[PDB]
Amino acid sequence: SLVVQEQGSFQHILRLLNTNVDGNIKIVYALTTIKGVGRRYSNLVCKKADVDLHKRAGELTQEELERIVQIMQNPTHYKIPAWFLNRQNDITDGKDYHTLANNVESKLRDDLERLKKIRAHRGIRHFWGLRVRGQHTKTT
Amino acid sequence: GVSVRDVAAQDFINAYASFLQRQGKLEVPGYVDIVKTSSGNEMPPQDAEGWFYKRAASVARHIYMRKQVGVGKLNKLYGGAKSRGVRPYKHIDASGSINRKVLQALEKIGIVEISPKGGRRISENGQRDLDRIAAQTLEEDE
Amino acid sequence: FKTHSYRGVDLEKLLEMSTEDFVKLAPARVRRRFARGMTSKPAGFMKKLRAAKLAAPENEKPAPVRTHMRNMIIVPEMIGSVVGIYNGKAFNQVEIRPEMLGHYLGEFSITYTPV
Amino acid sequence: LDQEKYDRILKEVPTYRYVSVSVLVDRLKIGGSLARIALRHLEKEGIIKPVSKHSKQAIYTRAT
RNA sequence: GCGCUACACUGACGGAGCCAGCGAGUCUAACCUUGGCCGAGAGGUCUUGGUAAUCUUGGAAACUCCGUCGUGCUGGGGAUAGAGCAUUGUAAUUAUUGCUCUUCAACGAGGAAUUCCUAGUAAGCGCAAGUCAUCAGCUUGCGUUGAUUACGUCCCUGCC
């Protein structure tokens, strides 16, 4: 409807989970320069959140940074339907949970090294550097 | 004298959509913002909204256009192919759910009805409510 | 230090338990394995697991069983058992566990060589 | 998006004859996402008089 | 070696118009499933019909619509990744697939080569079958849009 007069609280690069973000990019992404989140947990944490889906990554009230660091990380509460998921049943600690940013990188990790203690064939064929899904790959 | 046919295929869409947006009666089922409609769409509907009030004039104009049909029919219609990616592109039949529930909500007022043979037939009201509102969408064209 | 609590669910009951019990607690596949072609898997292993775990002195591992059921499951009553499996020719044995529990048997036995 | 991007826009886009959104990224450079906005806004008697169709091209133009 | 998407505004995203044809299909048991709900979704299911011009099944995509994007490796490119949530499968690990959101890899029209093609023909947008519990970037078959270029020679190869 117009060019919106963005004052500077347009602030021009952003930081969400230590893990970089850019600040005049159209949001749902930006939440996608991340691990473990991608335009589907992202278009829920914005609908269960009081959001814009067309705002940028710099243009962020902060009451919409800390509620959007927050649903994330929680999972079951602002209706997160649990099929929606990756840490689908822990199976070591159940649980209904989300594997995140720094954390999908050290849990990718801790799922291989409950089946390399074993000595089986879902994390021994990851072990020879060659693939486990059953195929003949030679070409690649 | 003044038809549903005599009028275009997205003005009736957006001018029954802002009729069934601004009716309140319409009910609005609980997996109708989130959940992906269709499974080859990644994107649900870009409205998230009262696609439900844009699927409430589609469905509905779509009935009346023919005899009868639905839910495993509005199942072959609303989707398209598949995004299989790499695998030469492939049809996928939606989710009977949302319109198995607008078809039991339209059942409510007197717009859509259950055609004997059975399954969705618009009533006798209903049509009354589409020839009132194909003549109120003919005068945004006139 | 903090022991493998199998799904703390709080080993304690994942040490020595039914066949109803963990019939449920496996990941999707297995539901469709204890309940499909259920009989005739252990017509006589859980009855040579119970002849083994059971003819020892315990703590000396027991006298090796035989088997070609690489198609059996890992359950919370075969905890310790000893087990010995056809890769097509010879009986490769295996340490049997609380953290092998829900996982595939003879994945383990490695058949085919690699290099 | 600051306030010598919309008033460079409106004093430059009344008699500015041929326009689009490839016209505001090559003349006013940054954006596009936004641009199909501060063009279209209104449509006050003094912005653009069009022979534009759908979505897929928006070919606008001169009030006079 | 056989192949899929793309280097764009003659496109990518979105509403709103919104269109066929080849099939198939459950019996001694779980093949097709709507409808009407529950799920953002992927789905779940109640229940329904159908041994089928009788059901799912008349609604597939390229497109016209109405525009946002504006010459920004992007709002072309969709690589590789982190988790979750689902849907099958005694076994999902060398994630069968799917969703949910973010990580945003090359390549800015493809050298020495070298194919296939004279009419609804070249080629692209789909889909139903053949696998099958599933997993198609293949095999087969169809149509819906559909032109260039000759309609001739023995320069060549090849064989008569």
Tokens at B5, concatenated: 């046919």
Could you say which of A1, A6, A24 has the minimum Cβ distance to residue D37? A1
Q: What is the DSSP code string of C15-77?
A: SS-----TTTSS-TT---SS------SSSSS---------S--------------TT----TT
- Whether residue C114 and residue A128 make contact (CB cut-off 8 A), yes or no, is yes
Query: What are the DSSP E strand ranges found in B15-132?
Result: none
Which residues in chain A are contacts of D5 at CB distance < 8 A? 3
Q: CA nearest B35: which of A31, A101, A27, A47?
A: A47
C4 touches strand E (CB under 7 A): no
Closest CA to A57 of A43, A70, A68: A68
User: Tokens in use for C38?
Assistant: 């259920």
B93: contact with A, CB 8 A cutoff: no
Cα–Cα distance, A87 to A33 (Å, whole number): 20
Tokens linked to C7: 């799904």
Q: How far apart are CA B17 and CA B11, in angstroms?
A: 9
Token reading at A8: 């500077």
Nearest CA-CA partner of B71 in B9, B127, B25, B114: B114
Which of these, B69, B94, B90, B89, lies nearest to B79 by C-alpha position? Answer: B94
Residue C86: beta bridge partners? C91
Task: Please list the residues that pair with A13 across neighbouring strands.
Answer: A22
Chains C and D touch (3+ CB pairs under 8 A): no
Which is nearest to B99 in space by CA: B38, B44, B41, B43?
A: B38
Q: A14 has which bridge partners? A: A21
Determine the distance between C46 (CA) and E30 (C1') in angstroms: 34
Partners of chain C (3+ Cβ pairs below 8 A)? A
Facing D3 at nearest CB: one of A5, A24, A26: A5
Q: Answer whether A93 sits within 8 Å of C5, measured CB to CB.
A: yes
For residue A121, CA distances in Å to A134, B12, C96, C110 come to 11, 60, 16, 8
Alpha-carbon distance C80 to C93, whole Å?
12
Q: Which residues pair with residue A21 across a beta bridge?
A: A14
Residue with tokens 């058992």: C81
Burial class for A68, CB neighbours closer than 10 Å (0-12, 13-18, 19+): buried
DSSP string spanning chain A? -----------SEE------EES-----------SS--TTSTTTTTTTTT--SSS-SS-----------------SSSS--------B-------B----SSSTT----TTT---SS----SS----S---TTS---TT-
Q: Which of C21, C65, C17, C71 is nearest to C41 (CA)?
A: C71
Q: Which helix (H) or strand (E) holds B39?
A: none
| DSSP annotation of D24 | S
User: Tell me, in Å, how far CA of C99 is from C1' of E4?
Assistant: 43
Are the Cβ atoms of A119 and C108 closer than 8 angstroms?
Answer: yes
Report the C-alpha gap between B40 and B79 in whole angstroms: 8
Is A79's CB within 8 Å of B34's CB? yes
How far from C67 is each of A71, B88, B130, C81, C96, CA to CA, in Å? 51, 45, 74, 13, 14
**Quick one: CA dihedral B110, B114, B116, B120, positive or negative?**
positive
Token pair listed for C100 = 């092998």
Query: Where does residue C5 rank: exposed (0-12), middle (13-18), buried (19+ CB within 10 A)?
Result: middle
Taking CB atoms and an 8 Å limit, are C27 and A91 in contact across chains?
Answer: yes
